[PDB]
Design a protein around this motif. Structure first.
Motif, PDB file in Angstrom:
ATOM      1  N   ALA A   1       0.810  -1.210   0.000  1.00  0.00           N
ATOM      2  CA  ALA A   1       0.000   0.000   0.000  1.00  0.00           C
ATOM      3  C   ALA A   1       0.848   1.267   0.000  1.00  0.00           C
ATOM      4  O   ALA A   1       0.531   2.223  -0.706  1.00  0.00           O
ATOM      5  N   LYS A   2       1.899   1.276   0.821  1.00  0.00           N
ATOM      6  CA  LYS A   2       2.813   2.415   0.962  1.00  0.00           C
ATOM      7  C   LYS A   2       2.162   3.605   1.676  1.00  0.00           C
ATOM      8  O   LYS A   2       2.849   4.429   2.273  1.00  0.00           O
ATOM      9  N   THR A   3       0.836   3.675   1.606  1.00  0.00           N
ATOM     10  CA  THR A   3       0.044   4.726   2.226  1.00  0.00           C
ATOM     11  C   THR A   3      -1.089   4.034   2.984  1.00  0.00           C
ATOM     12  O   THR A   3      -1.287   2.829   2.840  1.00  0.00           O
ATOM     13  N   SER A   4      -1.816   4.788   3.804  1.00  0.00           N
ATOM     14  CA  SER A   4      -2.918   4.230   4.585  1.00  0.00           C
ATOM     15  C   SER A   4      -3.889   3.461   3.703  1.00  0.00           C
ATOM     16  O   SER A   4      -4.387   3.989   2.706  1.00  0.00           O
ATOM     17  N   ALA A   5      -4.162   2.221   4.087  1.00  0.00           N
ATOM     18  CA  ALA A   5      -5.073   1.361   3.347  1.00  0.00           C
ATOM     19  C   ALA A   5      -6.038   0.697   4.306  1.00  0.00           C
ATOM     20  O   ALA A   5      -5.753   0.574   5.498  1.00  0.00           O
ATOM     21  N   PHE A   6      -7.184   0.282   3.783  1.00  0.00           N
ATOM     22  CA  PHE A   6      -8.195  -0.402   4.578  1.00  0.00           C
ATOM     23  C   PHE A   6      -7.812  -1.863   4.718  1.00  0.00           C
ATOM     24  O   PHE A   6      -7.202  -2.440   3.817  1.00  0.00           O
ATOM     25  N   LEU A   7      -8.171  -2.451   5.852  1.00  0.00           N
ATOM     26  CA  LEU A   7      -7.945  -3.863   6.112  1.00  0.00           C
ATOM     27  C   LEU A   7      -9.344  -4.470   6.076  1.00  0.00           C
ATOM     28  O   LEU A   7     -10.336  -3.756   6.250  1.00  0.00           O
ATOM     29  N   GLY A   8      -9.449  -5.759   5.798  1.00  0.00           N
ATOM     30  CA  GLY A   8     -10.764  -6.377   5.745  1.00  0.00           C
ATOM     31  C   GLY A   8     -11.230  -6.755   7.136  1.00  0.00           C
ATOM     32  O   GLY A   8     -11.475  -7.925   7.415  1.00  0.00           O
ATOM     33  N   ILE A   9     -11.354  -5.756   8.002  1.00  0.00           N
ATOM     34  CA  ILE A   9     -11.758  -5.949   9.396  1.00  0.00           C
ATOM     35  C   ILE A   9     -12.671  -4.779   9.741  1.00  0.00           C
ATOM     36  O   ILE A   9     -12.368  -3.625   9.396  1.00  0.00           O
ATOM     37  N   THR A  10     -13.761  -5.062  10.445  1.00  0.00           N
ATOM     38  CA  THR A  10     -14.708  -4.014  10.786  1.00  0.00           C
ATOM     39  C   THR A  10     -15.605  -4.372  11.968  1.00  0.00           C
ATOM     40  O   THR A  10     -15.865  -5.549  12.225  1.00  0.00           O
ATOM     41  N   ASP A  11     -16.041  -3.352  12.704  1.00  0.00           N
ATOM     42  CA  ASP A  11     -16.959  -3.541  13.827  1.00  0.00           C
ATOM     43  C   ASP A  11     -18.244  -2.775  13.495  1.00  0.00           C
ATOM     44  O   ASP A  11     -18.802  -2.076  14.334  1.00  0.00           O
ATOM     45  N   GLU A  12     -18.706  -2.936  12.255  1.00  0.00           N
ATOM     46  CA  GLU A  12     -19.917  -2.281  11.758  1.00  0.00           C
ATOM     47  C   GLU A  12     -21.162  -2.795  12.448  1.00  0.00           C
ATOM     48  O   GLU A  12     -22.024  -2.022  12.860  1.00  0.00           O
ATOM     49  N   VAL A  13     -21.283  -4.114  12.487  1.00  0.00           N
ATOM     50  CA  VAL A  13     -22.433  -4.754  13.097  1.00  0.00           C
ATOM     51  C   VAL A  13     -22.555  -4.386  14.572  1.00  0.00           C
ATOM     52  O   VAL A  13     -23.446  -3.630  14.960  1.00  0.00           O
ATOM     53  N   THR A  14     -21.627  -4.899  15.374  1.00  0.00           N
ATOM     54  CA  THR A  14     -21.612  -4.663  16.814  1.00  0.00           C
ATOM     55  C   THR A  14     -20.364  -3.875  17.211  1.00  0.00           C
ATOM     56  O   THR A  14     -19.242  -4.346  17.032  1.00  0.00           O
ATOM     57  N   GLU A  15     -20.571  -2.666  17.727  1.00  0.00           N
ATOM     58  CA  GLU A  15     -19.481  -1.795  18.147  1.00  0.00           C
ATOM     59  C   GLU A  15     -18.567  -2.488  19.157  1.00  0.00           C
ATOM     60  O   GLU A  15     -19.040  -3.056  20.144  1.00  0.00           O
ATOM     61  N   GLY A  16     -17.263  -2.462  18.888  1.00  0.00           N
ATOM     62  CA  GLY A  16     -16.304  -3.086  19.782  1.00  0.00           C
ATOM     63  C   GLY A  16     -15.933  -4.501  19.390  1.00  0.00           C
ATOM     64  O   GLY A  16     -14.945  -5.039  19.889  1.00  0.00           O
ATOM     65  N   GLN A  17     -16.739  -5.134  18.547  1.00  0.00           N
ATOM     66  CA  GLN A  17     -16.429  -6.489  18.110  1.00  0.00           C
ATOM     67  C   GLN A  17     -15.984  -6.450  16.651  1.00  0.00           C
ATOM     68  O   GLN A  17     -16.821  -6.424  15.736  1.00  0.00           O
ATOM     69  N   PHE A  18     -14.670  -6.348  16.447  1.00  0.00           N
ATOM     70  CA  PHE A  18     -14.097  -6.309  15.104  1.00  0.00           C
ATOM     71  C   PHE A  18     -14.127  -7.702  14.487  1.00  0.00           C
ATOM     72  O   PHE A  18     -13.695  -8.688  15.096  1.00  0.00           O
ATOM     73  N   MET A  19     -14.673  -7.764  13.276  1.00  0.00           N
ATOM     74  CA  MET A  19     -14.823  -9.006  12.528  1.00  0.00           C
ATOM     75  C   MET A  19     -14.093  -8.936  11.179  1.00  0.00           C
ATOM     76  O   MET A  19     -13.878  -7.845  10.634  1.00  0.00           O
ATOM     77  N   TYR A  20     -13.706 -10.094  10.650  1.00  0.00           N
ATOM     78  CA  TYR A  20     -13.047 -10.142   9.343  1.00  0.00           C
ATOM     79  C   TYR A  20     -14.172 -10.095   8.324  1.00  0.00           C
ATOM     80  O   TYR A  20     -15.261 -10.607   8.586  1.00  0.00           O
ATOM     81  N   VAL A  21     -13.926  -9.477   7.172  1.00  0.00           N
ATOM     82  CA  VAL A  21     -14.955  -9.407   6.138  1.00  0.00           C
ATOM     83  C   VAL A  21     -15.233 -10.816   5.660  1.00  0.00           C
ATOM     84  O   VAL A  21     -16.294 -11.102   5.112  1.00  0.00           O
TER      85      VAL A  21
END
Ligand SMILES: CO[C@@H]1O[C@H](CO)[C@H](O)[C@H](O)[C@H]1O
Ligand SMILES: CO[C@@H]1O[C@H](CO)[C@H](O)[C@H](O)[C@H]1O
Ligand SMILES: CO[C@@H]1O[C@H](CO)[C@H](O)[C@H](O)[C@H]1O
Ligand SMILES: [Ca+2]
Ligand SMILES: [Ca+2]
Ligand SMILES: [Ca+2]
Ligand SMILES: [Ca+2]
Ligand SMILES: [Ca+2]
Ligand SMILES: [Ca+2]
Ligand SMILES: [Ca+2]
Ligand SMILES: [Ca+2]
Ligand SMILES: [Ca+2]
Ligand SMILES: [Cl-]
Ligand SMILES: [Cl-]
Lengths: 154, 154, 154
Positions: free
Chosen positions: C79-99
């Protein structure tokens, strides 16, 4: 046997076409193609205009042509040195046309350019155009050697 | 039906061959291949010589071999760090040969190299060759891990 | 004889399928794929998380997910610059999940991260994870635009 084999063969061919299209998409992505945008590529080699034309043609591309600020910037960023653009006035002196046909609709000439200069001693004036380091344009001899940047559709 | 279907398949196959050749040409070009010149590619992975040979083999290429100062420069430019060259004296100590066979036609040995040094502790002397950052050559143990740089024909 | 022609055509197809596999191997290699390791690639385009997911999907890959220190560095370098990872806590705040499913196992959070900040002015908190230039993880708004990096299997 024969008909089942022919049907499998059609399926093998189709799967191959699908996979190659996927390969092409991945390759474009890795080469920096932005979503829905035409993309530019270079091998960083310098050569006379006729060669760039021949080369890009062999790749089923065209010599890069910026149609707006964004594209001009993209080409500038890809080339990183003087690069030929697909614009010349070889057909009618002073009238710059795209190699792909048509008069210029977007220009980004450097100050005092184009000047169809003869002082280069290469014979003739200047009928080709290059994008120079800062994105500005300069007409140059089609016989001079500049970076080959090919363009592929969006 | 059958024969017409079979005739179309021939056309489908032929068209696919041409498309794949085009993809390869475009990939070579994006990878920096210059017209009529061999090109070098690396994934920036470090590994023992046996691994580089097997890797380049699988890709239908060969371990990078500099035949002149230009190519030597190209390889060092591609590798960025110490990389194995397709040259070793494994067959006869002291006589460096191309892995592809034949005696050297060009060399760029650093001062006091090759020395078939044993001080590395990997066992044995030094039968492989690495091109160091500054383009110079050093014989190193084939068991040591250096950058894999493959070469593809002009 | 039809059968003979059919047999020969099947052979051609096999040669082509091997040729395309080779093309795919060479491309991955030229793009930095290490032997036996996942492959990460980017077109250097910055876009919101939704678009990165869409793009990688079209390529038949997934948004890059680091599962250990090695992969973390590998993505950072690509990436060399800031990139998104396939991880998110969209559903439940605080619980990071893999896409790709599942609760986050490996993590390389910075100090004070994740903090779910709201004052970014994009609405909501920070439900996405970006691998910043330094390599560490920091949660961010899934609406901000960051570099698209896709991963493909080992
Ligand atoms: C210093 O740049 C050169 O200037 C000349 C005019 O003197 C011509 O315009 C040439 O095309 C241009 O490359
Ligand atoms: C400091 O470089 C090393 O010097 C040794 C001799 O002392 C051998 O030549 C090694 O191959 C070389 O890498
Ligand atoms: O630095 C920034 O700090 C903020 C809190 O003040 C949030 O954590 C942001 O994600 C982070 O980029
Ligand atoms: Ca089959
Ligand atoms: Ca002119
Ligand atoms: Ca000029
Ligand atoms: Ca058809
Ligand atoms: Ca030796
Ligand atoms: Ca030595
Ligand atoms: Ca939330
Ligand atoms: Ca959150
Ligand atoms: Ca944060
Ligand atoms: Cl001219
Ligand atoms: Cl050795």
């Amino acid at each position: 046997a024969i008909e089942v084999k022919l049907a499998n063969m059609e399926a093998e061919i189709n799967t191959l076409k699908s996979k190659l299209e996927l390969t092409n998409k991945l390759h474009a992505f890795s080469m920096g193609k932005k979503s829905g945008k035409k993309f530019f590529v270079t091998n960083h080699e310098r050569m006379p205009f006729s060669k760039v034309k021949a080369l890009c043609s062999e790749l089923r591309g065209t010599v890069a042509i910026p149609r707006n600020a964004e594209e001009n910037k993209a080409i500038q960023e890809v080339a990183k040195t003087s690069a030929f653009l697909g614009i010349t006035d070889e057909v009618t002196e002073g009238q710059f046309m795209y190699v792909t046909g048509g008069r210029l609709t977007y220009s980004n000439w450097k100050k005092d350019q184009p000047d169809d200069w003869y002082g280069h001693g290469l014979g003739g004036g200047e009928d080709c155009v290059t994008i120079v380091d800062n994105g500005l344009w300069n007409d140059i001899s089609c016989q001079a050697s500049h970076t080959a940047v090919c363009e592929f559709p969006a």
